[PDB]
Design a protein around this nucleic acid. Structure first.
Length: 61
DNA sequence: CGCTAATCGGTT
DNA sequence: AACCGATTAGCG
């Protein structure tokens, strides 16, 4: 069952994703597309990163 | 083993 | 179409 390679986010990308999450728990389609483009990530990579980050936030609360 | 990226099926 | 919760799985 082929899967995608695990993305290794740069420190710059993780820093900017965490910054975005501190500002907004969810992104609009537009804001997700803008952040993806700004970080040279796919829309899916940013969507999944935000989904998993909300899961972690739920657990740590 | 812990952290977390990616995948699956169900919910809305 | 995006999310959620459960799950699978890569790597330090």
């Amino acid at each position: 069952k082929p899967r995608k390679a695990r993305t290794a986010f740069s420190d710059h990308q993780l820093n900017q994703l965490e910054r975005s999450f501190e500002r907004q728990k969810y992104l609009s389609v537009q804001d997700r597309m803008d952040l993806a483009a700004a970080l040279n990530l796919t829309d899916t990579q940013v969507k999944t990163w935000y989904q998993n980050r909300r899961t972690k936030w739920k657990r740590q609360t």
